[PDB]
Amino acid sequence: EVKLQQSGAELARPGTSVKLSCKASGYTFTNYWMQWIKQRPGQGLEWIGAVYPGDGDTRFSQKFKGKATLTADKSSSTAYMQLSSLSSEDSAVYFCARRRVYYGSNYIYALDYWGQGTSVTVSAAKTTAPSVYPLAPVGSSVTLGCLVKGYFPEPVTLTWNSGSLSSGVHTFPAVLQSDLYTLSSSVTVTSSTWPSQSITCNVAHPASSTKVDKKIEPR
Amino acid sequence: DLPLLCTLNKSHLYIKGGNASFKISFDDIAVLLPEYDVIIQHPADMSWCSKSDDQIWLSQWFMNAVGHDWYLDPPFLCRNRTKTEGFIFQVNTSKTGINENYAKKFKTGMHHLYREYPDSCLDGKLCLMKAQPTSWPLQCP
Amino acid sequence: DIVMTQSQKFMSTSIGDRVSITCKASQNVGSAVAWYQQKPGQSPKLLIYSASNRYTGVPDRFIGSESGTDFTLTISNMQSEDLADYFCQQYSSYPLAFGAGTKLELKRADAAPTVSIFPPSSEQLTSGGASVVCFLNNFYPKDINVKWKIDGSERQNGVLNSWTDQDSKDSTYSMSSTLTLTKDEYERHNSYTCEATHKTSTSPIVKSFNRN
Ligand SMILES: *[C@@H]1O[C@H](CO)[C@@H](O[C@@H]2O[C@H](CO)[C@@H](O)[C@H](O)[C@H]2NC(C)=O)[C@H](O)[C@H]1NC(C)=O
Ligand SMILES: *[C@@H]1O[C@H](CO)[C@@H](O)[C@H](O)[C@H]1NC(C)=O
Ligand SMILES: [Cl-]
DSSP: OOEEEEOOOEEEOTTOOEEEEEEEESSOGGGEEEEEEEEOTTOOEEEEEEEOTTTOOEEEOGGGTTTEEEEEETTTTEEEEEEOSOOGGGOEEEEEEEEEOOOSSSSOOSOOOBOOOEEEEEOSOOOBOOEEEEEOOOOOEEEEEEEEEEEBSSOOEEEEGGGTOOTTEEEOOOEEETTEEEEEEEEEEETTTTTTSOOEEEEEEGGGTEEEEEEOOOO | OOOEEEEETTTEEEEEETTEEEEEEEESOOOOOTTTSEEESSGGGGGGTOSOHHHHHHHHHHHHHTTOOTTTSOOEEEOOTTOSSOOOEEEEOOOSGGGHHHHHHHHHHHHHHSTTOOOOOOTTSOOEEEEEEOOOOTTOO | OOOEEESOSEEEEOTTOOEEEEEEESSOOTTOEEEEEEOTTSOOEEEEETTTEEOTTOOTTEEEEEETTEEEEEESSOOGGGOSEEEEEEOSSSSOEEOOOEEEEEOOOOBOOEEEEEOOOHHHHHTTEEEEEEEEEEEBSSOOEEEEEETTEEEOTTEEEEEOOOOTTTOOEEEEEEEEEEHHHHTTOOEEEEEEEOTTOSSOEEEEEEOO
């Protein structure tokens, strides 16, 4: 069966380089050009370029010339993409996909198989545990919050009452700003639910090996 | 002496000349481009297309047989012999824009060359002829 | 290079409706056009190739069509599982080019956001930081604008915004807006306001507190 297996998540400092890999299985590696595509958070697909493993011939999008270096190792059936002089604009998910070498009209020349994607995050930060702040109100329902700031890298696992309070919860996607992440979550309950019953925000950050509980107390 | 021509299923076209044997394909894939490949403006420019005298000879014969004017007609393309992806030459047969006149000349040449030329280049559509090596089909003469 | 100009970045649809997504090639590419479907966190999947051919296992409801340089992807009857991103692509020649993409979202009744404001926590102030948080929850449609005002003056610097994707159950959207200052900068002002502009109201929804 045809499979394209990409290397794991990358964390890199600004101005450095990373080399992403895409290992092909179940087909003749040399009958295909390996394509590379970038996808920035919440944005579309952007074609980077392709490599032919037979002799390493390349094709690029004009924008990525001087940014991406494309190689392939026929022996290991692996294509590589090196991204140089890394900046914040390089933080994205990168996919590999295959496209058949042309041999008459009766093949599909679209990108039929794709890798699972590789995440690249550019930041000057070292592994940093988050600061977790309980947000108590300043009706029929009450909204409480939890603010998670100054951490790196992703992910953090945020739950309310160890996940027993799941309805009326909004956990927002983490945002990277000035090399560190911020994440926030709100929980809405009836006026009869809180503060009579205790509500605590739980935050786990495995990268820093930290687990923090913050009980929401009236101001 | 004269190269052998074959049509299978009234759509798959072939040509054989000595040790060289090609399949002739027509579709919208622009495999070669003047930015990347060898521009052919004189028959001698084809020395860069292959290390094989027979592949060069058959390509030049085909182009002469369809009435190509090496100097006045639009140039065509081939992959540089130093590349390993494979021998190939590409002619633009698009019946559109500035190429229309040449596409009609090519169509005429193909109708004279092949007994039943099954013309697949639609009016106004991108259509590129690619000639690639293939084993001479078993059902061919 | 050939460029693919895709129709609308966002389309509101109803389940069972006929939906059409269009793409325009900058030059003739014959029929060498593909359509891809992508769901969040997944790889894109090939739907259509050669402008109108359905790829392996693609259901009948996905119809690709062409007219010169105009390409169309039609979903004859949109199913719940069809809410996703769609991308056209030309593959006639290198460089390959993708359309900018179209996200199909679900139509539902308009809903005003529920707005909640939170002054900095005692713990954050102790550490020298001051974040003011505004949640704008369960609204529809997705377009919303949040303006931070400090003593009636608009503030742009130090704002961090985050948006949820369309909720799977109630089809609403939510947003979080965090204004971060130093404790010293925070103590130099009194009134903190987050104002939300949404089509459900002709006047902004205003949530405010005074530091003093
Ligand atoms: C076919 O490819 C070769 C490269 O393999 C081209 O030769 C090079 O030409 C440059 C000048 O443009 C020289 O500086 C290099 O030393 C050459 N390299 C080699 C390995 O010979 C050749 O010009 C190409 N043919 C055409 C017609 O473009
Ligand atoms: C052309 O001839 C050479 C030997 O002279 C041979 O290696 C090659 O395979 C021949 N071409 C084909 C397609 O048979
Ligand atoms: Cl269906």
